[PDB]
Amino acid sequence: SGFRKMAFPSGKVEGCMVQVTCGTTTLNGLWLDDVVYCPRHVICTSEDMLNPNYEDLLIRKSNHNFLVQAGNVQLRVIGHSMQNCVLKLKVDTANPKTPKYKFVRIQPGQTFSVLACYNGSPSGVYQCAMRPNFTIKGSFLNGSCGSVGFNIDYDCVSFCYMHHMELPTGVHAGTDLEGNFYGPFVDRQTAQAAGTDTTITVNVLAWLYAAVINGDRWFLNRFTTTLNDFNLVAMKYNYEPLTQDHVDILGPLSAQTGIAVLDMCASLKELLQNGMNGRTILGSALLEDEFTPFDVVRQCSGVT
């Protein structure tokens, strides 16, 4: 028992991290097979970032301007191209540590692990949710761009995120591995509105199920509700409206605990309306939304 904000083991991703330098700018790259992927803003200077013309900036660069180093060794760059907001540097050597991998575009509300890196060296790993407004609340400092987000299904790494920037509000934005930003964000130093965010209802319910499984049961009540009634409360408290698709995804946890999904919704309704009254659930004094129903089952079953 016990329930922690657990990240995937980062080893398979650590073996793919490299440092990419272009001019005076250094960030991280992801080396998979004979390609290194990195944010295109590695080609910018401080002058450029207020409104960069990436096409023009990239035209001044040749393969030999992209310095790619895999720890101690230098990679030879034999091609470069820009795809959306990422650069793809073709190298003459396939990464011998390339795991089985896929590039996926995750949905808002899904979770993933981030391997924070600086100068191509991994520094730490943590678990994130992609917020409903397509930002992530990460931990990133100067030099962290190019750090990636991923999930692991046995031996296959699904890369879903590459870090690009910190908004003036202190939240983070980035792209899928094809360089498409999540959300409305652009890679320029401008004020950028992140939409109104909401709490990921299906994840809060999954975490209440994790709490019951792990013995924290004080919040269970004698009530039930309907999707309609619960959604009036979700609207008032800025929670995502719950749908039958969310109820269906919670099916396995409902079966495991014997607590019908709408009865758990009634517990969540009372917690939203009354608060925790100074109590905690799984070591938290707030309603946690960074665990999906798949995360809760994986953690509560023992998936390797």
Catalytically annotated residues:
41, 145
Q: Binding partner of residue 195 among its own copies, ligand L1F, none, CB under 5 to 8 Å per kind?
A: none
Q: Which residues of the chain form contacts with its own copies (CB under 8 A)?
A: 1-12, 14-15, 115-119, 121-126, 137-144, 166, 170-172, 214-215, 275-276, 278, 280, 283-286, 298-304
Helix/strand/coil for 224: coil
SS3 118: strand
Nearest approach, Cβ of residue 277 and its own copies (Å): 12
Give the number of residues in contact with ligand L1F, rule: CB under 6 A.
16
**Choices 88-96, 142-150, 234-242, 277-285 (CB under 6 A): range interacting with ligand L1F:** 142-150
Interacting positions 121-140 with ligand L1F (CB under 6 A): 140
- Beta strands of 65-168 (E only): which ranges? 66-70, 73-75, 77-83, 86-91, 100-103, 111-118, 121-129, 148-153, 156-166
| Whole-angstrom distance, CA of residue 150 vs CA of residue 101 | 10
The answer to the question of residue 146 lying near ligand L1F (CB under 6 A) is no
Residue with Cβ nearer ligand L1F (49 or 58): 49
Amino acid residing at 115:
L
Contacts to ligand L1F from residues 170-229, by CB under 6 A:
172, 187-189
Q: Choosing among ligand L1F, its own copies, none, which partner's interface includes residue 251 (Cβ < 5 to 8 Å by kind)?
A: none
* Pairing mode of beta strands 100-103, 156-166: parallel
How far CA 210 is from CA of 67, 77, 112, 274, in Å, comes to 47, 48, 18, 21
Counting contacts by CB under 6 A, is residue 148 touching ligand L1F? Answer: no
Grouping H, G, I as helix, E, B as strand and the rest as coil, residue 166 is strand
Shortest reach from residue 185's CB to ligand L1F, in Å: 8
In the complex, least distance from residue 141 CB atom to its own copies, rounded to whole angstroms: 5
Q: Which does 21 bind (CB under 5 to 8 A by kind): its own copies, ligand L1F, none?
A: none
Nearest alpha carbon to residue 175 among 149, 201, 207: 149
**Alpha-carbon gap, residue 99 to 56, rounded angstroms:** 34
Q: Is 41 in the site for ligand L1F (CB under 6 A)?
A: yes
123 binds, among ligand L1F, its own copies, none (CB under 5 to 8 A by kind): its own copies
| 34 interface partner picked from ligand L1F, its own copies, none, CB below 5 to 8 A per type | none
Shortest distance, CB of residue 276 to its own copies, whole angstroms? 8
After which residues are there C–N gaps above 2.5 Å in the chain? none
Separation CA 43–CA 60 (nearest Å): 9
> Read out DSSP for 58-74?
HHT--GGGEEEEETTEE
Q: Can you tell me the distance from the alpha carbon of 147 to that of 122, in angstroms, rounded to the nearest whole number? A: 9
Q: Which residue has the tokens 């100074």?
A: 278
Residue 189 site contact among its own copies, ligand L1F, none (CB < 5 to 8 Å, cut-off depends on kind): ligand L1F
Scanning 72-80, 101-109, 160-168, 266-274 for contacts with ligand L1F by CB under 6 A, the matching segment is 160-168
The span from the CA of 298 to the CA of 272, in Å, is 27
What residues line the site for ligand L1F (CB under 6 A)? 1, 41, 49, 140-145, 164-166, 172, 187-189
